[PDB]
Amino acid sequence: AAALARLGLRAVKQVRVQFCPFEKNVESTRTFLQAVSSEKVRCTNLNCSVIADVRHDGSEPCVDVLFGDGHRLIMRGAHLTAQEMLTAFASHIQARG
Amino acid sequence: FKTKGVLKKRCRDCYLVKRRGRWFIYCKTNPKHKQRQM
Amino acid sequence: EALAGAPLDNAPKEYPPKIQQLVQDIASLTLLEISDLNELLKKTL
Amino acid sequence: PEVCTDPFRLTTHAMGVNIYKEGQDVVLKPDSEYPEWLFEMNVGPPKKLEELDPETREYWRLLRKHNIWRHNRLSKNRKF
Amino acid sequence: SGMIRAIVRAGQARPGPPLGPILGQRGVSINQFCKEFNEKTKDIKEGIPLPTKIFVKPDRTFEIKIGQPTVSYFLKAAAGIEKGARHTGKEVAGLVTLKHVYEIARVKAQDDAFALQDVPLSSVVRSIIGSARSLGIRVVKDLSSEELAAFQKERALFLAAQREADLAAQAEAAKK
Amino acid sequence: FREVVEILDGKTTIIEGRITETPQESPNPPNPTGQCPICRWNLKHKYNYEDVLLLSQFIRPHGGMLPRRITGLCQEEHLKIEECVKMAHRAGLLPNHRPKLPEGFVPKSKPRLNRYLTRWSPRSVKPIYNKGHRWNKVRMPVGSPLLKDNVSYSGRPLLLYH
Amino acid sequence: PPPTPPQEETGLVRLLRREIAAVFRDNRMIAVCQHVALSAEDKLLLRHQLRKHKILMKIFPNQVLKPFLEESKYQNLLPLFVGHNLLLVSEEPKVKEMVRILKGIPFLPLLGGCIDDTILSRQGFINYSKL
Amino acid sequence: FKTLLPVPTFEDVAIPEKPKLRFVERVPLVPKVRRERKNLSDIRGPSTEATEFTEGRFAILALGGGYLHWGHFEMMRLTINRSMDPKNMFALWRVPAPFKPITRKGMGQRMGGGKGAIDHYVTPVKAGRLIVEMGGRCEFKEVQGFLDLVAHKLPFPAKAVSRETLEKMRKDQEERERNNQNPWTFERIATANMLGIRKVLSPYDLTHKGRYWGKFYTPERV
RNA sequence: ACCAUAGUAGGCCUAAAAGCAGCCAUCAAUUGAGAAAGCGUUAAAGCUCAACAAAUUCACCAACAUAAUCCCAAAAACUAAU
Numbered sequence A: 001a002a003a004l005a006r007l008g009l010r011a012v013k014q015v016r017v018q019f020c021p022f023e024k025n026v027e028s029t030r031t032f033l034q035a036v037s038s039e040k041v042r043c044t045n046l047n048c049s050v051i052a053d054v055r056h057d058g059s060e061p062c063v064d065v066l067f068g069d070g071h072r073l074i075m076r077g078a079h080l081t082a083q084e085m086l087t088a089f090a091s092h093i094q095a096r097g
Numbered sequence B: 001f002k003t004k005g006v007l008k009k010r011c012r013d014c015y016l017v018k019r020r021g022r023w024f025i026y027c028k029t030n031p032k033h034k035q036r037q038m
Numbered sequence C: 001e002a003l004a005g006a007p008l009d010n011a012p013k014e015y016p017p018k019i020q021q022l023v024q025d026i027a028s029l030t031l032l033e034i035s036d037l038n039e040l041l042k043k044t045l
Numbered sequence D: 001p002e003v004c005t006d007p008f009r010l011t012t013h014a015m016g017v018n019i020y021k022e023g024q025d026v027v028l029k030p031d032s033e034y035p036e037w038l039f040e041m042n043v044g045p046p047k048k049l050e051e052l053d054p055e056t057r058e059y060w061r062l063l064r065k066h067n068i069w070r071h072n073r074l075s076k077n078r079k080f
Numbered sequence E: 001s002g003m004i005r006a007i008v009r010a011g012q013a014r015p016g017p018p019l020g021p022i023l024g025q026r027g028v029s030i031n032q033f034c035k036e037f038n039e040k041t042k043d044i045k046e047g048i049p050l051p052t053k054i055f056v057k058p059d060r061t062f063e064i065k066i067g068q069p070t071v072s073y074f075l076k077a078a079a080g081i082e083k084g085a086r087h088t089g090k091e092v093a094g095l096v097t098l099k100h101v102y103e104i105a106r107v108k109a110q111d112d113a114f115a116l117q118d119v120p121l122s123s124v125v126r127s128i129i130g131s132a133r134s135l136g137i138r139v140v141k142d143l144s145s146e147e148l149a150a151f152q153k154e155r156a157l158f159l160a161a162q163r164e165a166d167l168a169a170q171a172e173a174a175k176k
Numbered sequence F: 001f002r003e004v005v006e007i008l009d010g011k012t013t014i015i016e017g018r019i020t021e022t023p024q025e026s027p028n029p030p031n032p033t034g035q036c037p038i039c040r041w042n043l044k045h046k047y048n049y050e051d052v053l054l055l056s057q058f059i060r061p062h063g064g065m066l067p068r069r070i071t072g073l074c075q076e077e078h079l080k081i082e083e084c085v086k087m088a089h090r091a092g093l094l095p096n097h098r099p100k101l102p103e104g105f106v107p108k109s110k111p112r113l114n115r116y117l118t119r120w121s122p123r124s125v126k127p128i129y130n131k132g133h134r135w136n137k138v139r140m141p142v143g144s145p146l147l148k149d150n151v152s153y154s155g156r157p158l159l160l161y162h
Numbered sequence G: 001p002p003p004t005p006p007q008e009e010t011g012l013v014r015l016l017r018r019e020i021a022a023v024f025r026d027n028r029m030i031a032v033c034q035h036v037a038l039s040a041e042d043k044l045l046l047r048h049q050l051r052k053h054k055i056l057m058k059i060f061p062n063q064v065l066k067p068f069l070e071e072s073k074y075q076n077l078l079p080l081f082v083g084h085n086l087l088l089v090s091e092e093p094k095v096k097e098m099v100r101i102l103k104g105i106p107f108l109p110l111l112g113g114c115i116d117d118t119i120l121s122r123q124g125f126i127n128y129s130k131l
Numbered sequence H: 001f002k003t004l005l006p007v008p009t010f011e012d013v014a015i016p017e018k019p020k021l022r023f024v025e026r027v028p029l030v031p032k033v034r035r036e037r038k039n040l041s042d043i044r045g046p047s048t049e050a051t052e053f054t055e056g057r058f059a060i061l062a063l064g065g066g067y068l069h070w071g072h073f074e075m076m077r078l079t080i081n082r083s084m085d086p087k088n089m090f091a092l093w094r095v096p097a098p099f100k101p102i103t104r105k106g107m108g109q110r111m112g113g114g115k116g117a118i119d120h121y122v123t124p125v126k127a128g129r130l131i132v133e134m135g136g137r138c139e140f141k142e143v144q145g146f147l148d149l150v151a152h153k154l155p156f157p158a159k160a161v162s163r164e165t166l167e168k169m170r171k172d173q174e175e176r177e178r179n180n181q182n183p184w185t186f187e188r189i190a191t192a193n194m195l196g197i198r199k200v201l202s203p204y205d206l207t208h209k210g211r212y213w214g215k216f217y218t219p220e221r222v
Numbered sequence I: 001a002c003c004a005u006a007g008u009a010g011g012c013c014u015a016a017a018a019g020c021a022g023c024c025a026u027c028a029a030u031u032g033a034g035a036a037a038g039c040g041u042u043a044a045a046g047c048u049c050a051a052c053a054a055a056u057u058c059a060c061c062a063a064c065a066u067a068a069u070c071c072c073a074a075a076a077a078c079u080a081a082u
Ligand SMILES: [Mg+2]
Pocket: H151, H152, H153, H154, H155, H156, H157, H158
């Protein structure tokens, strides 16, 4: 949460995390959602739309970030760790935007 | 840098790293806390 | 003892057998029983 | 910049509840209009660790407070 | 834009410090704020203090939210005392009955804190009891017929003695 | 083992985590009741810096060591293996466990000096100009003191300082 | 290693288990949600809106809740209790109002729950609200 | 989630009047007119006095021998008084005021001519003796923290010990001495006069058992 | 890493003393947070600690420059040694 807060998320439009809580490999995605929907991340940019899609039969937890560079970062996290996902997202944000 | 026989952290931001065979208190917030083990 | 598996609407195709057996019990009775049943439900609820 | 009262008016009613301009002070309703459990609260020394039983949340709240106090006392000397 | 808390009087809403400069720095006019406060609290007894929250929006627009007065003021008014005790616990300033405590709790239940935290009146009564303990006001179960005045007389003589001792100490320090 | 792959197409990035098959432990350990890998395979006080077949079992493909909470070693065995890996890397063993830099591999430098049983980092030691006399002699450390408990068939203790 | 030195269960964990059992036995509607760390004023406003409908929320440690869950008949709720958890506790289950008041915040996901010993997912709660 | 442990409560201990350390005189009220020989046996060997706690729970233990003079006494007094809480702690001395005179030549630096002139007074301290003893309603961590400075500034090596720590180190020493593996020990060899080692040993080595060498005490010598 | 809201700016002194020049109390709301253990402000604000919620490899002290004609055997970590 602190890493995203110290990044200036002002240049992010929409972040949607779609997962199934009843699966066994959605823990990393849930932790990513909690880290990206924190109070500091909310206050560092207000126009960002954070969506949490819950399914039961999807069985494929994924995250989508659409931002105003006309850019789409999609990460289908089934074995990715939460820390690695956060680092990759932060690197892409500080690279483009 | 101050060359000392005993290194102690003078704040919470001091970090101890071993370089060139010696021990170092490096500090970024307060550069005056730079200490080098003799 | 345990609970169900929480099926969703994405692939909803199986229903609990309780409703089917209730329908079968309803259908396996005569019009006199139907009249008594509906009058009893009217009186109670 | 308000004013208090010296005579038995204090014993006959309170002087804080009335906030609006009109002096519609509330009367002292007896126990017939006040709850019984109100008069059954610890108004003296706070409950102690040896007084509280170990099967209530109050005991563990007090233990947590004492642990925080102990940590503060032992960390009074902040080396860094 | 930000969150502003202010202890303001019911009708003595002056456009001066320490409240006028803060709102001027924020950007909203202070005359409008004073007028709105006076018209909103014109039915409240002038002189009592009360906390209020000021919300400032871009284009320099302000809104006012006013809560219940301070428990310190409530308990001091209930006990009939003008100022609290210095040495808390070792000396007692006044006596407040559990009945007065319950009345204060009932009248203050309609504040933002205890409204957002939907709790029974027992919690509010306990909070008022703790505030009285901090104030140095003892909370007797049920004792007020004339002993309240009997204690008031001795409290007045003790306050006079304390004032004399403070004057003597100040004179000794000045001559030292 | 897990790998992260990145795909770029039309200013869109997709990263995927792919799991490939990894080798498992051998079926028959000589001492199955040991709680530690080395200490149950009976390699305690048995390996050295030159036993790369054991030292390379758990090191990252770029030469870094693996965490103890993942490997399962006891603390002393983890420290011994870390020191052995350092000594092997300095000696020149494990030549394929280095990062690939085509831009830096072209500017060749002075030929590497052959060495082994090197305790300190080569760039952190100062030459001993004085060297002392017999009563106060400055000795050169060789090997590591962590491996002083290894089995000695000849019976002579290892000369860690010479 | 030597045999296990069984750690005595203290009053804190005993009372937590007692409260969890009372919650799981008394009330009927037990929903599970992900606890998102936000401002305390937002938390207080959420409790305010929930207590408008007289349905509460609780937080219990996982170290205590997981053994109770696997020992009880709710072993199918294990995947719902990995991260930060919120237990919405309700008598006279009213999922429609809960969905209506939680729709305002888009990023609070309904992990699932049970209504009268019937495990239902977010789709199940949608169905109950539609009913 | 972590368990809640009870905290130690101190109610039986009572803080006495004047918990600060008392001022000590550099010279005794009656000075010693007669110059005495510098017996170093008051430093050599283990201590027999002030080796056990009397009223406090923490102490400064001396692991070696030496002389304490008014500078050391003033240092200890000032440091402990300024870093100790009078409302919850109390401290007491365990060494007497400087009484043993020390002489310096002064007039004339050539060898001979007689004894020197009394310059200052010292308090001889042996290894294993307590110097300052503290107690009260406090925990050992803070007392150890601000007593390690005094222990370091003392001439002889010293530690900030407690009753539990002193008992632990004594029991560890006893365990080491009982489970020592090699059959050959300094005490056994010295008492049996094996190899004629009494020729190079000392008559006090039979009692010191090789753990004390002059004014230095080595606690790891069994 | 992890977030830190409440009666309340606790009561006195003070130009101001809002957890923090100081003295006395040290209660109480919440499932969980000391009238506050360190930075910071004239005073506020703000940054941390302990508290809950999440996981939890191991973690108490121990390291310390130098001289004068030119450094000073060379070298060696495993073939069995009471
Ligand atoms: Mg010393």
